[PDB]
Scaffold this active site. Structure first.
Site, mmCIF file in Angstrom:
data_model
loop_
_atom_site.group_PDB
_atom_site.id
_atom_site.type_symbol
_atom_site.label_atom_id
_atom_site.label_comp_id
_atom_site.label_asym_id
_atom_site.label_seq_id
_atom_site.Cartn_x
_atom_site.Cartn_y
_atom_site.Cartn_z
ATOM 1 N N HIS A 40 0.627 -1.417 0.082
ATOM 2 C CA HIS A 40 0.137 0.290 -0.285
ATOM 3 C C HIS A 40 0.709 1.350 0.019
ATOM 4 C CE1 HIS A 40 0.034 -0.247 4.553
ATOM 5 N NE2 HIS A 40 -0.141 0.605 4.374
ATOM 6 N N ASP A 84 0.101 -7.870 1.804
ATOM 7 C CA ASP A 84 0.139 -6.488 1.718
ATOM 8 C C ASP A 84 1.386 -6.098 1.941
ATOM 9 O OD1 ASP A 84 0.948 -3.647 1.852
ATOM 10 O OD2 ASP A 84 0.090 -3.506 3.968
ATOM 11 N N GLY A 175 2.920 6.536 7.638
ATOM 12 C CA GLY A 175 3.921 6.999 8.307
ATOM 13 C C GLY A 175 4.733 6.279 8.580
ATOM 14 N N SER A 177 4.209 2.924 8.546
ATOM 15 C CA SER A 177 3.299 1.889 6.734
ATOM 16 C C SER A 177 4.835 1.254 6.125
ATOM 17 C CB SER A 177 3.107 2.944 5.368
ATOM 18 O OG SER A 177 2.046 3.011 6.947
ATOM 19 N N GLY A 178 4.613 0.148 5.503
ATOM 20 C CA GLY A 178 6.402 -0.711 5.091
ATOM 21 C C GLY A 178 7.056 -0.610 6.225
HETATM 22 N N1 BAK Z 1 1.087 6.792 0.301
HETATM 23 C C1 BAK Z 1 -0.302 6.411 0.362
HETATM 24 N N2 BAK Z 1 -1.037 8.165 -0.531
HETATM 25 C C2 BAK Z 1 -0.225 6.861 1.234
HETATM 26 C C3 BAK Z 1 0.542 5.660 1.951
HETATM 27 C C4 BAK Z 1 0.725 5.088 3.182
HETATM 28 C C5 BAK Z 1 -0.933 5.060 3.706
HETATM 29 N N3 BAK Z 1 -1.041 4.934 5.289
HETATM 30 C C6 BAK Z 1 -2.186 4.827 5.442
HETATM 31 C C7 BAK Z 1 -3.575 4.604 6.605
HETATM 32 O O1 BAK Z 1 -4.519 5.442 6.523
HETATM 33 C C8 BAK Z 1 -2.860 3.891 7.430
HETATM 34 N N4 BAK Z 1 -1.554 3.032 7.617
HETATM 35 C C9 BAK Z 1 -1.441 2.436 8.814
HETATM 36 C C10 BAK Z 1 -0.443 1.609 9.527
HETATM 37 C C11 BAK Z 1 -1.374 1.487 10.353
HETATM 38 C C12 BAK Z 1 -1.868 1.831 11.693
HETATM 39 C C13 BAK Z 1 -2.277 1.063 12.783
HETATM 40 N N5 BAK Z 1 -3.219 1.817 13.595
HETATM 41 N N6 BAK Z 1 -1.224 0.649 13.535
HETATM 42 C C14 BAK Z 1 -3.114 2.870 10.829
HETATM 43 C C15 BAK Z 1 -2.761 3.016 9.242
HETATM 44 N N7 BAK Z 1 -3.006 3.661 8.941
HETATM 45 N N8 BAK Z 1 -2.614 6.296 4.189
HETATM 46 C C16 BAK Z 1 -1.727 5.504 3.522
HETATM 47 C C17 BAK Z 1 -1.629 6.278 2.485
HETATM 48 ZN ZN ZN Z 2 0.075 2.962 6.080
#
Ligand code: BAK
Ligand code: ZN
Ligand code: CA
Ligand code: CL
Ligand code: ZN
Ligand code: ZN
Length: 223
Positions: A40, A84, A175, A177-178
């Site tokens: 994602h 993912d 942020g 993420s990944g």
């Molecule tokens: N390139 C983009 N447009 C993008 C990239 C990463 C994103 N990530 C979210 C997100 O919405 C999102 N990533 C998450 C990771 C962990 C948790 C958590 N609560 N552990 C919640 C999260 N929500 N939107 C995103 C949009």
């Molecule tokens: Zn994310």
């Protein structure tokens, strides 16, 4: 990362920052030419930044390398976030040293109860927005699949696991993420999703990397 602490510069040497003009996702270095992140986090035009601590200041230990190719898992489903995971190949090999190192892939999956280290430059507020410039860390245990599934009914597959605290307060967030979830010296998870960040009975959900080792090994050897 909400409710975590400042890691310390370069104390997580396998952590990467994916940048497309700004930091948007984390990743893990698995060998000098490849990085694993979340599907994602896919974008075209990614530059991988290694040896980072403060992402807004060049402190001297960084390596900025553009990606030559990205490979999203063949079965990634953007609606459920199942599978993912994505692989990113660097245009040049990174130079490994004490500040830039790769992390090992797991030989088996980890047990519920195992404590892991999650890191990233994502939001630090549950009800608010504050993005840190230095790397934050969080130690959290893998939760039972039953508490994970009761928190997200009909949404968890065998390629996902939950880690965190049901009381709320500590979690990874947008942020982050990944990025990496390392337990016993092996990369066991990838920050994938959750409900908000650090909410009670809504733990973070991670990609279960032990299910993709053959796919990873086979893909990097053929690319
Ligand atoms: N390139 C983009 N447009 C993008 C990239 C990463 C994103 N990530 C979210 C997100 O919405 C999102 N990533 C998450 C990771 C962990 C948790 C958590 N609560 N552990 C919640 C999260 N929500 N939107 C995103 C949009
Ligand atoms: Zn994310
Ligand atoms: Ca920096
Ligand atoms: Cl910078
Ligand atoms: Zn979002
Ligand atoms: Zn979200």
């Amino acid at each position: 990362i909400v409710g975590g602490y400042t890691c310390g510069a370069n104390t997580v040497p396998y952590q990467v920052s994916l940048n497309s003009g700004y930091h948007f996702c984390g990743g893990s270095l698995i060998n000098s030419q490849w990085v694993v992140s979340a599907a994602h986090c896919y974008k075209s035009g990614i530059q991988v930044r290694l040896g980072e601590d403060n992402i807004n200041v060049v402190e001297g230990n960084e390596q900025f390398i553009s990606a030559s190719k990205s490979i999203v898992h063949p079965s990634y489903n953007s609606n459920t976030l199942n599978n993912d995971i994505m692989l990113i190949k660097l245009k040049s090999a990174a130079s490994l040293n004490s500040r830039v190192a790769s992390i090992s892939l797991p030989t088996s999956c980890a047990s519920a109860g195992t404590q892991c280290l999650i890191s990233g430059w994502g939001n630090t507020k549950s009800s608010g927005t504050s993005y840190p410039d230095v790397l934050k860390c969080l130690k959290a245990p893998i939760l039972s699949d039953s508490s994970c599934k009761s928190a997200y009914p009909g949404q968890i597959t065998s390629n996902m696991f939950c880690a965190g605290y049901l009381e709320g307060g500590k979690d990874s967030c947008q942020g982050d993420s990944g990025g990496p979830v390392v337990c016993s010296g092996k990369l066991q998870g990838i920050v994938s999703w959750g409900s908000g960040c650090a909410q009670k009975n809504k733990p973070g959900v991670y990609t279960k990397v032990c299910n993709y080792v053959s796919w990873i090994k086979q893909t990097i050897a053929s690319n």
